[PDB]
């Protein structure tokens, strides 16, 4: 499973100064796709992000490309060169009411009514399509304020008509909250695991999306997938990526979290997890650190511990064939899991999330430095070559250490007590190859 | 115990275009059986399925055969060539009301009042016999809708007379739910176990059905039957089969399920199991994964664990001789079970559910591919010969892997994101002998043939 050419899959191209509500295609592409000037369209990017836009023809736009500005790209979680899909969006109703909120660092020193100075002029007679979760910037007077759509009615998208009530009351959204959302883990945040992610799409996502495929040929897909491998290889990261990328309902079950609960509560929470999944099928259940809740029914002296293992076995068996629920799990101690959980019809497929090679190490180093300020002498391939035996977590730690060393080198220009770090220290901060070589000397993968 | 020739046992034969309410016999058969034109009859198929029909003579019908259409065959869970039984059904009364529901995939884009367009014209002045659980198809305008009979009054069958109230209101039945039902496990879904299924019928079904036989000769039949053998040999499958085939009440007790319950709740559920069985006798109790609830009273450090074992012992002893309850159990670790449970009067009979041979393996492979699209080059006897050391579960896994490989080969025509798989990919999908060879050559099937020489 790689990415196939389809007529509605298009490469993201720039449109500086373009309005937030507009995307451009070439006329032949529009003709191919049966899209007419002014049509509302639905765009799909990464990590299940969507955007509703107006489509306009552009004779400077290549057939295979879509022009869109930076606001739309950010909402779609995509960069220039990425691929998106476009489809008609005919069903879109005029809005009854919408609720948007300002981002806290764009309104410090509250001056000017937000509705009157920003939103009213932005939406005035424009009939903008909007979607819940959109972030958009607006200029008002000599200032710019960033807003988030928190709710729309109808949900999750509508047209902002003259009659749509615009609510902007409440506590401003924190930049840190939205920045945490903005860099939620996707498949792109996973290095050195191309083969495994493909195993995962074929065993988990494909049967949940297209069960007709499996019915057609007359095969029941396996329902239990164990990720295993040593610590820090990316098992939990992959879970986060699946959670954020899948089209199914996702229910995370954390091993130590169940085990931390009162006797009786552990079992109950497991049952509720499976029930929620079932009710919301198609669904994925992910049981992280499976060994914590399901060790061999001999290496648990506790009656409650054996009981919880029994409870999971019952829940795995209890999942009807037509439930459309795939259970994923992860462990760094697979030989410690009760063998009963590994029988036909339970966890009977396995995916080795192991030690990356040099090429995978480089992938991982590029991912973990993407938001890091690097000097021009940083050679990551050279770092990749010198980190044999390192897994993903050792590489992220190495990157952090090089950064921390870069900061340590300015401790002669920082005083802990100042309320403000000197701007020119802030502006010039870069991680150098030397900082990396120094971390390479401190890095111990154990 | 094999199948005996009886005058009312007949071979299922085709009747294309026949009405859903009609079966045909030869006139001599009808004479033999004392059946007259238009009589209502009760048909019995597999997995306790029944059908009520009208019987008509047919001079093209062999004496030993019964003609019936595809609707009736599906209701009886039988195919062409299977045997069914027929008997008069004189007791049948006009229904006060019946309730049916459409199948969801037959009503998408809800066009038409279902009663007026389909049911009314289907039942109009026809006086159709119908049974709870029947599925039947009806054409109305340019469409066809499949319905299930969910309830009848009287129950479970009646005649749909002019004055019978037909209800079709409610949420449509899911096709997936009925496909699951249709493919519920029977004795035909168990391969390579002929000898053991006979042991089971002789030790379980026979004393429950004909206790007089055992009384007459003066013998108390054993009341505890332990199925044992290695993992994936079909112990649970057999339990499913028995549950769906037996004429008795069936109460399943799952080991890990009892063990997952609160201290005190485990013991209570065991008691309730035995009580329900007793109240509903003749009954079978099946305790799957017995080792989970009854390991040796030394290899359990838990007071509650020892208490549960004691509870089962008490419940086994507590079953009066006239209770008409047979307890089956299954385990893949029989030497781990408390020896007290294997004394005279408890689990004192045993059935070895073991490794199949090549002929058994082939049976298993035909069962597991019956609903699978096979290419013409698939040679299952050859697959049987190349799976030494394989049990049932390994054969089902082998089949699934071949099919999964077949799908993997089309991953250049499938994009995960499409709403719809391309039709001609759907239509042409078949598992080939190469797909099977690929599955056979895999680490796991290959490591497994060494295991049993
Ligand atoms: N394949 C990878 N690609 C990119 N970053 C990775 C990878 N593996 C690990 N990392 C980094 O290391 C961090 C910790 O890894 P986790 O996914 O929590 O390890 P894990 O495999 O779940 O470990 P265990 O078994 O719970 S100790 C991640 O959150 C990433 O920042
Ligand atoms: N004799 C058989 N005939 C046909 N199919 C079988 C047979 N045995 C196993 N299978 C297949 O393998 C699957 C698992 O078999 P089960 O009956 O659950 O195994 P089991 O013997 O109960 O295993 P344990 O002891 O609980 S691990 C079944 O659902 C069938 O698909
Ligand atoms: Mg982890
Ligand atoms: Mg079993």
UniProtKB/Swiss-Prot annotation, chain A:
The modification N6,N6,N6-trimethyllysine is found at residue 299. It catalyses: ATP + H2O = ADP + phosphate + H(+). ATP 1 binds at residues 231-237, 332, 368. Its EC number is 3.6.4.6. There is a cross-link at residue 2 (Glycyl lysine isopeptide (Lys-Gly) (interchain with G-Cter in SUMO2)). Keywords: Acetylation, Amyotrophic lateral sclerosis, ATP-binding, Autophagy, Charcot-Marie-Tooth disease, Cytoplasm, Disease variant, DNA damage, DNA repair, Endoplasmic reticulum, Hydrolase, Isopeptide bond, Lipid-binding, Methylation, Neurodegeneration, Neuropathy, Nucleotide-binding, Nucleus, Phosphoprotein, Transport, Ubl conjugation, Ubl conjugation pathway. One of its GO terms (molecular function) is BAT3 complex binding. Changing residue 167 to W: Severely reduced binding to DERL1. Changing residue 302 to A: Does not affect methylation by VCPKMT. Changing residue 169 to K: In CMT2Y; normal ATPase activity; impaired autophagic function. Changing residue 216 to E: In IBMPFD1; increased ATPase activity; no defect in ubiquitin-dependent protein degradation by the proteasome; impaired autophagic function; defect in maturation of ubiquitin-containing autophagosomes; decreased interaction with CAV1 and UBXN6. The keyword RNA-binding does not apply. It is found in: Cytoplasm, Cytosol; Endoplasmic reticulum; Nucleus; Cytoplasm, Stress granule. The modification Phosphoserine is found at residues 21, 446. One of its GO terms (biological process) is translesion synthesis. It is an enzyme of class 3 (hydrolase). Changing residue 124 to D: Severely reduced binding to DERL1. Coiled coil: none annotated. Belongs to the AAA ATPase family. It is linked to Inclusion body myopathy with early-onset Paget disease with or without frontotemporal dementia 1: An autosomal dominant disease characterized by disabling muscle weakness clinically resembling to limb girdle muscular dystrophy, osteolytic bone lesions consistent with Paget disease, and premature frontotemporal dementia. Clinical features show incomplete penetrance. Necessary for the fragmentation of Golgi stacks during mitosis and for their reassembly after mitosis. Involved in the formation of the transitional endoplasmic reticulum (tER). The transfer of membranes from the endoplasmic reticulum to the Golgi apparatus occurs via 50-70 nm transition vesicles which derive from part-rough, part-smooth transitional elements of the endoplasmic reticulum (tER). Vesicle budding from the tER is an ATP-dependent process. This is Transitional endoplasmic reticulum ATPase. It comes from Homo sapiens. The chain holds residues 17 to 462 of 806 of the full protein.
Swiss-Prot record, chain B:
ATP 1 binds at residues 231-237, 332, 368. Keywords: Acetylation, Amyotrophic lateral sclerosis, ATP-binding, Autophagy, Charcot-Marie-Tooth disease, Cytoplasm, Disease variant, DNA damage, DNA repair, Endoplasmic reticulum, Hydrolase, Isopeptide bond, Lipid-binding, Methylation, Neurodegeneration, Neuropathy, Nucleotide-binding, Nucleus, Phosphoprotein, Transport, Ubl conjugation, Ubl conjugation pathway. One of its GO terms (biological process) is ERAD pathway. Changing residue 169 to K: In CMT2Y; normal ATPase activity; impaired autophagic function. Changing residue 37 to A: Minor effect on affinity for ATP and ADP. The modification N6,N6,N6-trimethyllysine is found at residue 299. Its EC number is 3.6.4.6. Changing residue 353 to T: In IBMPFD1; uncertain significance. The modification Phosphoserine is found at residues 21, 446. Changing residue 299 to L/Q/R: Abolishes methylation by VCPKMT. Changing residue 175 to Q: In FTDALS6 and IBMPFD1; abolishes enhancement of K-299 methylation by ASPSCR1. Changing residue 81 to E: In CMT2Y; increased ATPase activity. The keyword DNA repair applies. Changing residue 124 to D: Severely reduced binding to DERL1. It is an enzyme of class 3 (hydrolase). It catalyses: ATP + H2O = ADP + phosphate + H(+). Changing residue 115 to R: Severely reduced binding to DERL1. Belongs to the AAA ATPase family. The PIM (PUB-interaction motif) motif mediates interaction with the PUB domain of RNF31. Necessary for the fragmentation of Golgi stacks during mitosis and for their reassembly after mitosis. Involved in the formation of the transitional endoplasmic reticulum (tER). The transfer of membranes from the endoplasmic reticulum to the Golgi apparatus occurs via 50-70 nm transition vesicles which derive from part-rough, part-smooth transitional elements of the endoplasmic reticulum (tER). Vesicle budding from the tER is an ATP-dependent process. This is Transitional endoplasmic reticulum ATPase. It comes from Homo sapiens. The gene is VCP. The chain holds residues 17 to 469 of 806 of the full protein.
């Amino acid at each position: 499973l790689k990415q196939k050419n389809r007529p509605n899959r298009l490469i993201v191209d720039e449109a500086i100064n373009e309005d937030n509500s507009v995307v451009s295609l070439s006329q032949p592409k529009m003709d191919e796709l049966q899209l007419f000037r002014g049509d509302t369209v639905l765009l799909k990017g990464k990590k299940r992000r969507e955007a509703v836009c107006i489509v306009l023809s552009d004779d400077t736009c290549s057939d295979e490309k879509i022009r869109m500005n930076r606001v739309v790209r950010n909402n779609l979680r995509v960069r220039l060169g990425d691929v998106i899909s476009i489809q008609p969006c005919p069903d879109v109703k005029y809005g009854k009411r919408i609720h948007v909120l300002p981002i806290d660092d764009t309104v410090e020193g509250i001056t000017g009514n937000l509705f009157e100075v920003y939103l009213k002029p932005y939406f005035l007679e424009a009939y903008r399509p909007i979607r819940k979760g959109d972030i958009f910037l607006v200029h008002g007077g000599m200032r710019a304020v960033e807003f988030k759509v928190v709710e729309t009615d109808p949900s999750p998208y509508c047209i902002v008509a003259p009659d749509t009530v615009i609510h902007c009351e409440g506590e401003p959204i924190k930049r840190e909250d939205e920045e945490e959302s903005l860099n939620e883990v996707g498949y792109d945040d996973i290095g050195g695991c191309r083969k495994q992610l493909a195993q995962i799409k074929e065993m988990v996502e494909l049967p949940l999306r297209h069960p007709a495929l499996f019915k057609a040929i007359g095969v029941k897909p396996p329902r239990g997938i164990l990720l295993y491998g040593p610590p820090g290889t990316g098992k939990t990261l992959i879970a986060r990526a699946v959670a954020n990328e899948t089209g199914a309902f996702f229910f995370l079950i954390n091993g130590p979290e169940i085990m931390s609960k009162l006797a009786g509560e552990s079992e109950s929470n497991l049952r509720k997890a499976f029930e929620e999944a079932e009710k919301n099928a198609p669904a994925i259940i992910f049981i992280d650190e499976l060994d914590a809740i399901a060790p061999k029914r001999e290496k648990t002296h506790g009656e409650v511990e054996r009981r919880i293992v029994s409870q999971l076995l019952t829940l795995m068996d209890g999942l009807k064939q037509r439930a459309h629920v795939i259970v994923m799990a992860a462990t760094n101690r697979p030989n410690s899991i009760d063998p009963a959980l590994r029988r036909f019809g339970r966890f009977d497929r396995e995916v080795d999330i192991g030690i990356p090679d040099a090429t995978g190490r480089l992938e991982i180093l590029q991912i973990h430095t993407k938001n890091m300020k690097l000097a021009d002498d940083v050679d990551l391939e050279q770092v990749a070559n010198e980190t044999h035996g390192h897994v993903g977590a050792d590489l992220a730690a190495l990157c952090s250490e090089a950064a921390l060393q870069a900061i340590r080198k300015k401790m002669d220009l920082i005083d802990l007590e100042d309320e403000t770090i000197d701007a020119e220290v802030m502006n010039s901060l870069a991680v150098t190859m030397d900082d990396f070589r120094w971390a390479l000397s401190q890095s111990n993968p154990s």
